[model samples]
Target chain A: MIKVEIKPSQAQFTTRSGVSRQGKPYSLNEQLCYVDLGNEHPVLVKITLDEGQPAYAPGLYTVHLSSFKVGQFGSLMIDRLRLVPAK
Target chain B: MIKVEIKPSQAQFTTRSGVSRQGKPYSLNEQLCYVDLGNEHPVLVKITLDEGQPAYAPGLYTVHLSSFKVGQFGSLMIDRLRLVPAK
Candidate 1:
């Protein structure tokens, strides 16, 4: 009863400034993830997704890894990296 | 109540011959995974693991994706690929 999702396409975002919560200029390829609290499980869990390769353009991508324990707020990690256009 | 496991070390399987069920000679870089029926979830689920680049030696690795439905044997796909030694 657990789920993981990817924002299908996110090479474009409409932010007031080029920056985000980090207060630094944002890049077009950046992506983010959100996890709903009620929708999580109590057991120790492991998750993974391997989409071969991007067939189209370059972009920033990430994988969200989360873990939860009793009485403590859940912990999650967003591993972010990017693929740039052919140099 | 779900679990997916990787066969941690399959590169050193001591088989009478070097081939497997597929009849092709096995490569030392290949790995395999196993899933137990008793440990599974009923709802549609998605899993992902993006562990940046490997700091370990070049070897074959994979992501095991599986899906199940009512009255049918579960379906799974082995998205296998290799990381070769840098030349």
Candidate 2:
């Protein structure tokens, strides 16, 4: 299990608009959090909220990696953040 | 509209598993694509597929930024990739 620390100040709110898989237009207002894995680099992760789902408060979290890959241009792409309680 | 070029070789396949919002277990086999915006840094984007949906072919794409935030650790998190036709 991968664990990372996320500071409360590390989250930012942003909005995204696009067409969904069903071809219906949609816009998402969400939060983006950066988690440092101690590689001298922080990984980008997102916090998506469903209706009435509260924003994540800062603390230690167990992270599940959805997709991790190094790009041909030497870029790192990390996707699908599922946060679980730290135990 | 933000436009970026993605090469055919920039995509890699990976698998991710996690519990869903409805408490269902799920695993995803997906592709991660890195897009370079010429800022001396490449941005990570994900390409997700549903059943019977095909993977994205290499080409120029118009990207929609879902969430762009710089972490306190100076890490950049770019999330929510929406690929649209380049016009």
Candidate 3:
């Protein structure tokens, strides 16, 4: 499992003033969320909200990604999730 | 039905130079995906990929949000989706 901070909301990259520790160039995709972990190529991972859940809101959050399944939509599916602060 | 464009990847807002027609200040969140519809508050919507599908990839998309249910996570669930360019 990996722990990362998300700056919450769809316009995540635009709102932040400073370069996040995660570095620059992060965005959402049709399949697979892309994050440039300060590498030449951005790291692409699976992203999904739990069923009956709301769209992810705008805020700083700690998310857990345990297991990954190669999803049919071209992005991986992080089947397991744990949202910190329990909201 | 809404025809929206998503600049593929996690760093969507960062990479885009000019402001998108959708406007500024967007990001990802814990629940309830948000898009600033140039309104006082961002347009909060439900987001979910099809089961067995991959995480949504970066690209232009035409989504269908026929109904909305107040979700467990506080975001609505757009239960239906159709990916353009068929990826």
Candidate 4:
């Protein structure tokens, strides 16, 4: 599992759309968050929330490295976020 | 510019975290969208939304290739998503 940090004010609701080479169209509705990956620069992560899934807040968390990926744009992609217990 | 497709049902709210090689921590609160880049497989993208920025919706879009990247795990990351005008 990887450990990371999130700021309270770094999240926002947003949407994006695009067309495929074959002319097929697609789109999405979701939230976006800018997060710190223990580096000088903060990494942006895309999240998908289920109906009962909790929204992200300011805190520390550990995620499965398997779920982590570096995007072509240098951003980090993750499927899940596990909150770290406070000391 | 690169064209891509996003399915309406492919989005979800989620969060993830990790630690740097140096043991520093990081986290994020955001949305994740699964998009199609004209390939047989769908690519996952991490998004960061700014205040007033329009949320993603079902449609086709053309994004600056400069804003696109392939993650180590093969996910696509983008800083911005531009909608394509209907023809």
Candidate 5:
């Protein structure tokens, strides 16, 4: 089973280890961004001995989104947040 | 083990089979996006019996980042690109 959680992230970094090649990340310019309630949110999944089932080990998984409303993902800061789980 | 090749992509879709939750993915608008030489590009990996070795499993792995200069990943539709690998 895959479980997910979403909230206004405490902070936004260059993303997944900072070695991003999207050209030096002018993210310094800043902007509004959102978290995908789907795959991008931090997830805790369970794996079992069942065949043809989603295999998940207990760990952290996450995804991020930068928005266009702002100039950049760093351009606009989000303050409100929410999370919902789905099967 | 992993290796990557870069070329101007043919289509910059909504990303990841199109199940994003970053608020409906305004990606209909896109702009100046660059491919990461690091991890975002699709990679060919190899896995072996060697312990403490980079795993390679001849499958596709990918990551992506949207840009601001263009308006969205779909908005700006990149026409030219370059890729450089690192050791």
Candidate 6:
């Protein structure tokens, strides 16, 4: 399972290993920016934040994720996503 | 494996099932907008579009996907992403 820690302001991709992509201003409003994984397969899923909640603060927020199980079997797939923060 | 078909104009989520989320204009440049899935585990990966190409037009794009194997075992995970196309 791919894992990442993200903030509201900037989108950050932090895995267990530690190495990560640089940050960028992706968000276009108060809502978090869309983490872009280039032309990767996109999955439709419901994201539950820290403690299985919906939203949170600028601190470290953990996102619980899983495949929303689209279509029948296989089609489009996503690799990963990374974001910096808002300024 | 989760699958999805996407366009460049709007951010759409289309899986095998058919039912999808409405489109959103999330992109901020000539590039496609980022498909955001609320709060979910984010993955970083290299995306090869139609016929293993880099970029394309407003047509149908298929994304090949796999786990980047961030960190070690299990940690953060991503559900899915959706996009419509560019206008």
Per-candidate interface DockQ score: 0.02, 0.03, 0.02, 0.04, 0.02, 0.04
Evaluate residue A66 in candidate 6 and report its C-alpha lDDT on the 0 to 100 scale. 32
Comparison by TM-score, 1 against 2, better one:
2
What are the interface RMSDs of all the models?
Answer: 15.1, 12.2, 15.2, 12.4, 16.8, 12.0
lDDT of each: 0.25, 0.49, 0.32, 0.41, 0.24, 0.28
How well is each residue in A1-87 modelled by candidate 3, as lDDT tens digits? Answer: 122233333312222232224677433221123232222332333344433454444433333322322234432233333333213
Q: What are the chain B TM-scores of all models?
A: 0.21, 0.50, 0.32, 0.41, 0.19, 0.24
Off by over 4 Å in 6: A1-31, A39-65, A73-87, B1-87
Better of 2 and 6 by TM-score: 2
> How big is the positional error of residue B52 in model 2, measured in Å on the Cα after superposition?
37
Candidates 2 and 6, the one with greater DockQ: 6
lDDT of 2 by residue, B8-64 (tens): 774434456734567886775455454554333445555554435455556666544
What tens digits encode model 5's per-residue C-alpha lDDT throughout A12-81?
Answer: 2222222125656322211122323233443222111222322222223222221111123312211111
User: Model 1, residue B87: what's the lDDT?
Assistant: 24
Better of 2 and 3 by lDDT: 2
Where does the lowest 10-residue lDDT sum fall in candidate 3 chain A?
A11-20
Q: Compare candidates 5 and 6 on DockQ and give the better one.
A: 6
Query: Model 3, DockQ value?
Result: 0.02
Count: clashes, candidate 5: 20
Can you tell me which runs of candidate 5 are displaced by over 4 Å? A1-29, A37-87, B1-54, B63-87
Q: Candidate 2 falls in which docking quality class? A: incorrect
Model 4, A1-87: lDDT tens digits are: 133444565333344563335677645334434334333454555544333445545565433323334468523433333333122
Docking class of 6: incorrect
